[PDB]
Point group: C3
Chain length 173, copies 3
C-alpha cells in the first residue's frame, strides 16, 4: 500500500489519504477487507494497482481466498453485464433461461459470506443494480451488518479512484 | 475455436471458460451474427488480448466489410452510449437540444442492418446504456430478428466481458 | 496533436473523426473549459494514447492550475462515481450512513469552481453515475452555467469516449 500512495499524483491527495484510511478498517476483518481490496483492484482493470495490492494481499489472504477474490471479479464481469442488460429490457426477457454457468458462486472455496461481499463490491464498480441489490440482500440474510457492506462499497470506490489516478500519470510520464 | 483464450483462462474462472466454449457453438446465431458479436464485444471490453485473438480467427468467419462494421459498431456506440445515457440521467431535460453528433455508419454500415444493430446492441450492454440498448432491441424486432437471437447476443457480450476481466488479471500478475 | 489522433482513426470510424474536428472547433466553451473537458474526459477513458495526445495539445490551452484541476476531477470522480452509483442502487437505504470519504479538492480545486464542476460532470457521464451527473448539473445551473455549455461538455465527453474506443481497437490489432 505504501507504494501506491507515493505513486499517486499531488492533485489526487484525497485518494491517497482515503487509501491509507481504508487499510485500517475496523468493521471488516482481514479476509473481508483484503479480499474486497483484491477483487476491487482486479475490477478496475488497472494492472499497476492489481500488482501492488495483490502483492501485499499475499500476507493477509490464503491461496483459496485469493483465487476466490479474483474469481469473484471475473464471474461478476459477466453477470454484471448480463443482468444489467436484462434489467434495461423491463423484464421482457425474464421468461428465458440465462443458461450461464456460475458454479463458483455456490462453491467459491471459502465462506460464501465473504464471496458475496466481494461480488457486491465488484458490482458497484461495474455498475449493475440487479446484482448489487441481490448480493446486498444475501449478505444481510447471513448476518452481515449494513456498516460492513457499506465499508466494502467505500473500499471499492477508493480503489477505483486509485486506479484512475495512477493510469493518468502513468500515461503522462 | 479461440483455444488460446480458453487455455489461458485461470482455474478459478472455469465457469467463464465453459461459457466461452458453449457460446461459440450455439445454434441460435449464424456465423456472421455470432462472430460479429464476439468481435464487437471483444473491442468493447478494451482488453487487447481478447481482441487480438478473436480478431485473428474472425478473418475466417467474417468478410472485411463485416469486420469493419463490427469494429465500427463498437466505436460509434462508445460515443452514443455516453451521450444518450447522460441525457437519460437528466430526465429529458435536454431532449429538445439537437445532439449534432454525426453517426452515418448507423444508417449505412456496409452490411445488413440487422447484424449491425445486433452488434450495437451487444456493445450497448457492455458499456451499460439503457437508452441505446432499448432502442437497438426495438430496431432488431422491427427487422424480424429472433427474440432469442437478441438474448443470445446479450449472453455473448456478458461472456466476453468475463473473459476480458479474467485474462486482464492474469496478465497483470504474470 | 488533434490531427495525429484523427489520422490514427480507421476509415470505419469516420464519424468519430468528424465529431472530434467539430467539437475542437467549438466556440461554445472557451479554451480552458473545452480543453479541460477534453483532458478530463481523456483521462476517464483510461486510454493512455488518447490522454497523451490530448494532454500534449492541452498545454497550449490550459494553465498549470486548470490542468491539475481537470486531472484531479477525473481522479476524484473515479471514486465518487462508484460510491454514489452503488449507494444509488440501494434506493436510499444507505443514505443515512456517513461516507467518510475525503474530497477536499472539490471545495478547493485551485481554480474557480464552475469549470471544475463542468469537468466533474463530464467525467460522471463517461463513468455513468446518475447521482453525480445530476448533482453536478444542478450545481452548474445554480452558479450561472447555461444548458448549451453543459450540453457541449456532454458531447465532448461522448466524442472523446468514441475516440478512445476506436484507437484502443487499432492499437490492439496492430
Amino acid at each position: 500500500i505504501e507504494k501506491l500512495k507515493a505513486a499517486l499524483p499531488e492533485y489526487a491527495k484525497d485518494i491517497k489519504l482515503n487509501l491509507s484510511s481504508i487499510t485500517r478498517s475496523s468493521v471488516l476483518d482481514q479476509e473481508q477487507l483484503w479480499g474486497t481490496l483484491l477483487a476491487s483492484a482486479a475490477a478496475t482493470r488497472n494492472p499497476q494497482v492489481l500488482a501492488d495490492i495483490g502483492a501485499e494481499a499475499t500476507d493477509h489472504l490464503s491461496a483459496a481466498a485469493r483465487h476466490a477474490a479474483l474469481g469473484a471479479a471475473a464471474i461478476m464481469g459477466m453477470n454484471n453485464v448480463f443482468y444489467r442488460g436484462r434489467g434495461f429490457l423491463e423484464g421482457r426477457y425474464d421468461d428465458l433461461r440465462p443458461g450461464l454457468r456460475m458454479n463458483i458462486i455456490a462453491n467459491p472455496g471459502i465462506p460464501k459470506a465473504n464471496f458475496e461481499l466481494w461480488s457486491f463490491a465488484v458490482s458497484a464498480i461495474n455498475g449493475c443494480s440487479h446484482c448489487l441489490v441481490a448480493h446486498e440482500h444475501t449478505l444481510r440474510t447471513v448476518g452481515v451488518d449494513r456498516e460492513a457492506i457499506f465499508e466494502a462499497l467505500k473500499a471499492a470506490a477508493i480503489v477505483s479512484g486509485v486506479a484512475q489516478a495512477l493510469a493518468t500519470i502513468e500515461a503522462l510520464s
